[PDB]
Amino acid sequence: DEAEASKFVEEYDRTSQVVWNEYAEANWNYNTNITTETSKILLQKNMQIANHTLKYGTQARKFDVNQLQNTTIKRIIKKVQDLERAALPAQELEEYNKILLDMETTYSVATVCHPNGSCLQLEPDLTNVMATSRKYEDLLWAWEGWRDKAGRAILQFYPKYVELINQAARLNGYVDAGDSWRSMYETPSLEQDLERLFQELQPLYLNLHAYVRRALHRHYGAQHINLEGPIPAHLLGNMWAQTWSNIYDLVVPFPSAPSMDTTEAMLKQGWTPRRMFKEADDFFTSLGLLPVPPEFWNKSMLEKPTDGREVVCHASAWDFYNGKDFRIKQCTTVNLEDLVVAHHEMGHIQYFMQYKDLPVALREGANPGFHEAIGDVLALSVSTPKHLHSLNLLSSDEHDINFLMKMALDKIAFIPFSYLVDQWRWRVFDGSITKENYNQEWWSLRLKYQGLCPPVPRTQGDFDPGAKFHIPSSVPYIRYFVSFIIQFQFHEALCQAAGHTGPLHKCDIYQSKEAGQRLATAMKLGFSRPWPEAMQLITGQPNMSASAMLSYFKPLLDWLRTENELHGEKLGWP
Numbered sequence: 001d002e003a004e005a006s007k008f009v010e011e012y013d014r015t016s017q018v019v020w021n022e023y024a025e026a027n028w029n030y031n032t033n034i035t036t037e038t039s040k041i042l043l044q045k046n047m048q049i050a051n052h053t054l055k056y057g058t059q060a061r062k063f064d065v066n067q068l069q070n071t072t073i074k075r076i077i078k079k080v081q082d083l084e085r086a087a088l089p090a091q092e093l094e095e096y097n098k099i100l101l102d103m104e105t106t107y108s109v110a111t112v113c114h115p116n117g118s119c120l121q122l123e124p125d126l127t128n129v130m131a132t133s134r135k136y137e138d139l140l141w142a143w144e145g146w147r148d149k150a151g152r153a154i155l156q157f158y159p160k161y162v163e164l165i166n167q168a169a170r171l172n173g174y175v176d177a178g179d180s181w182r183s184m185y186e187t188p189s190l191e192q193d194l195e196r197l198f199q200e201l202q203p204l205y206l207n208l209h210a211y212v213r214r215a216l217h218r219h220y221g222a223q224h225i226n227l228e229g230p231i232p233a234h235l236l237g238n239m240w241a242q243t244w245s246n247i248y249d250l251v252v253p254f255p256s257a258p259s260m261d262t263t264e265a266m267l268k269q270g271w272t273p274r275r276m277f278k279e280a281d282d283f284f285t286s287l288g289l290l291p292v293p294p295e296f297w298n299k300s301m302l303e304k305p306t307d308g309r310e311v312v313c314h315a316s317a318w319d320f321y322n323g324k325d326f327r328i329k330q331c332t333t334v335n336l337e338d339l340v341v342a343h344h345e346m347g348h349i350q351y352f353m354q355y356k357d358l359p360v361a362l363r364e365g366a367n368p369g370f371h372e373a374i375g376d377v378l379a380l381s382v383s384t385p386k387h388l389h390s391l392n393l394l395s396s397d398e399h400d401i402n403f404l405m406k407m408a409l410d411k412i413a414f415i416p417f418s419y420l421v422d423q424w425r426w427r428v429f430d431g432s433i434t435k436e437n438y439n440q441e442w443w444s445l446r447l448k449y450q451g452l453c454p455p456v457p458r459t460q461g462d463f464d465p466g467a468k469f470h471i472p473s474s475v476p477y478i479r480y481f482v483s484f485i486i487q488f489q490f491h492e493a494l495c496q497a498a499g500h501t502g503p504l505h506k507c508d509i510y511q512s513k514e515a516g517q518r519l520a521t522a523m524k525l526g527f528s529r530p531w532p533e534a535m536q537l538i539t540g541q542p543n544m545s546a547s548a549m550l551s552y553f554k555p556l557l558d559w560l561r562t563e564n565e566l567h568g569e570k571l572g573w574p
């Protein structure tokens with residue numbers, strides 16, 4: 001039945017391209033114009049694609065993959081045997097698809113109002129408050145309000161969501177949804193591997209945490225910051241305290257060595273979202289990589305519509321499975337942070353284009369982490385003072401430590417948060433956490449890993465996890481933890497390939513063809529081989545490692561230890 005295998009795969013591919021392209025269409029229309037009609041159509045298309053999935057998934061299961069020779073064929077068929085949600089009986093599938101849509105819409109349209117009538121949306125209103133306000137009470141208002149409006153509204157949907165996604169998981173041979181999600185890495189030692197990486201970054205995070213806590217103590221008062229306890233979750237410049245770069249002004253190591261207001265500069269010289277993406281497109285091409293198609297610039301939504309339209313603002317890259325149509329949907333704002341995000345998303349597009357000629361079943365990254373890392377890698381070089389200066393956005397060890405601190409506030413602070421999200425979800429999926437303890441366990445992990453505490457006590461009815469995009473949107477999060485670790489591994493490898501000598505953090509791979517070549521050969525593999533092969537192609541070795549990230553920040557770790565030591569900080573939070 002070997003010849004039958006090849007035929008089946010060829011047929012699965014042809015048909016899947018058509019149906020998946022059609023689905024992307026409806027999905028895109030809903031995401032870029034949330035309405036009753038677009039929602040209705042999306043739900044209808046869900047059943048259509050599920051029908052396709054069931055038809056081929058059923059046939060695929062009749063193949064004893066064990067008996068198949070061709071490994072590339074063996075691999076595709078094994079993947080098609082997994083029906084995902086399509087495994088759910090029609091009634092549950094319909095209810096499931098609606099739950100997902102209701103949670104997404106609820107999160108996307110949530111607003112926080114004032115007594116008068118001024119209501120703020122998450123993007124860019126609340127996001128801006130969290131990033132620029134230095135008033136304890138105003139930060140609290142936005143922080144609590146977002147959770148009161150978005151978080152609480154998602155709670156009514158989560159338990160049923162968990163029940164259905166787990167059922168689908170069990171119907172596909174997994175013990176639960178978390179199991180199914182983790183399988184995407186094809187790594188039996190995943191959990192222990194991730195745990196080890198997390199532990200390796202502890203010294204660095206705990207030291208960053210202690211330094212920032214001291215700075216907040218200095219700004220917000222001793223009566224509000226316990227130098228031996230967790231940091232209130234609304235003071236880090238970000239709604240989820242996942243990245244702390246926005247409070248750089250409160251923690252600058254050497255305030256005597258000032259740096260230009262990058263954002264002010266961008267706005268000052270008329271930078272626009274389109275300009276931001278163009279610059280990213282240029283960085284990829286400079287490496288010899290592929291430029292985005294003209295179609296990209298015409299169909300993408302690079303700005304928040306003013307049509308009055310309601311949309312899903314969270315940044316995302318789209319592959320329409322026809323090897324020609326690729327788009328980015330992002331409510332881009334003109335500032336450095338979003339400039340990095342633009343590169344992030346462009347990295348996804350580059351990946352799409354790179355493996356566009358493989359069977360659609362294999363048109364995925366080596367693993368989800370790889371897909372998230374590509375753009376961040378280039379953005380690391382983009383963020384260097386030298387590169388920013390070349391873009392006319394910027395104008396000495398002190399400047400060096402300040403830069404490292406700025407990078408750390410984003411990259412190091414994110415490590416514990418990115419680790420925490422799915423630790424929580426895996427436990428919800430496996431039944432360890434019931435709806436009675438959703439929130440309480442969320443905060444135990446928030447405390448355990450990030451050393452954060454809620455500024456206001458939480459109450460029955462609260463569901464803060466629902467206030468984070470990926471939860472109601474049901475998008476796995478561990479990919480971002482993996483990404484942040486491996487992107488430094490890639491940076492290190494690419495820099496060495498470019499001939500860079502000296503401190504890793506000073507490397508800029510701009511215009512390096514040797515660098516673009518390694519990324520290219522790896523991306524071309526798509527999901528055709530276990531990820532360690534792609535890892536090997538890029539770095540010369542096969543494992544995930546925190547060494548690159550540690551080496552990158554070494555100078556900062558040394559500075560932080562000395563600084564915290566002379567101030568007598570007690571690391572951690574008893």
Ligand SMILES: *[C@@H]1O[C@H](CO)[C@@H](O)[C@H](O)[C@H]1NC(C)=O
Binds near residue numbers: 037
């Ligand atoms: C928003 O979707 C509706 C369908 O409900 C459609 O009629 C309208 O034209 C769409 N708006 C834009 C700007 O495309």
Ligand SMILES: *[C@@H]1O[C@H](CO)[C@@H](O)[C@H](O)[C@H]1NC(C)=O
Binds near residue numbers: 006070071072073
């Ligand atoms: C395995 O099948 C795939 C898909 O048909 C084909 O591209 C590949 O060359 C085949 N490999 C071998 C060794 O036959």
Ligand SMILES: C[C@H](CS)C(=O)N1CCCC1C(=O)O
Binds near residue numbers: 315316480
């Ligand atoms: C934008 C991307 C997704 S394509 C996303 O959700 N990310 C990746 C960086 C961390 C992050 C997040 O929570 O915003």
Ligand SMILES: [Cl-]
Binds near residue numbers: 240464465
């Ligand atoms: Cl929270």
Ligand SMILES: [Cl-]
Binds near residue numbers: 477
């Ligand atoms: Cl993932």
Ligand SMILES: [Zn+2]
Binds near residue numbers: 348372
């Ligand atoms: Zn991404």
